[PDB]
Amino acid sequence: RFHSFSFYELKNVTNNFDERPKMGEGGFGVVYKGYVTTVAVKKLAAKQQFDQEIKVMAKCQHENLVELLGFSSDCLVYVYMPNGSLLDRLSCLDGTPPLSWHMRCKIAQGAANGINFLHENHHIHRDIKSANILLDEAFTAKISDFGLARASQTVMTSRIVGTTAYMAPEALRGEITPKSDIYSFGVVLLEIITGLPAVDEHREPQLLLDIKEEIEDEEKTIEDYIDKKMNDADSTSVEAMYSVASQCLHEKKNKRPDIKKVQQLLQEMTA
């Protein structure tokens, strides 16, 4: 099933859970680098989201989803993603070189295959964002964080969860539908095209999704928003990716395409 690791082996291999530049700062825990094979150890800090992560990972094994190796209770242990998150790579955090348009196209396709796998197997992610799209040694896109995921119809919740800058209008109201995951993917595609984060408190507009309306009101074009840190982008493929993002970002959930359509469209873009 999964490996059951001792707490003290994990404590050891992560230098007694050291937090010096530690890899990531997750929602309900800290991600540490370990050696057992190089691994990622998510030590949870202030319960239900632990069991949900194990349950989802046991059923969901795919090329575009992070692999859970095991757990601990005396901690969640995953395969090491050497190239970190898409967010970090888009911002060139710690001096990493900008991702080329070619790489970005492969990442978008990979992410859409991971989401397709989830929805195929009736799971709603509920927090699709570039920080939750990890990158391996070949820069393969792997969807992460399944602690808030839901085994799916259309339902409502009292505890509204996600990241506001990526959330769909109905998600922000408490609806649980895979249609919300599509909206959030559309925001990620805008981040890939522009190199801009979904929210920037010191930017006009603060929310990236507001650029779709600027483009639509014939004010500006997507060409003016293309990430300048690329030399291999072409109008045809950028416009094609933008067209997919635009469809994903329809305010009315029922007008959005399903993940299968998104997957088809992203493939046609490199055909």
Ligand SMILES: CC(C)Oc1ccccc1C(N)=O
């Ligand atoms: C799935 C999460 C917990 O894994 C990570 C999170 C953040 C940064 C790297 C990794 C990794 N796997 O290397």
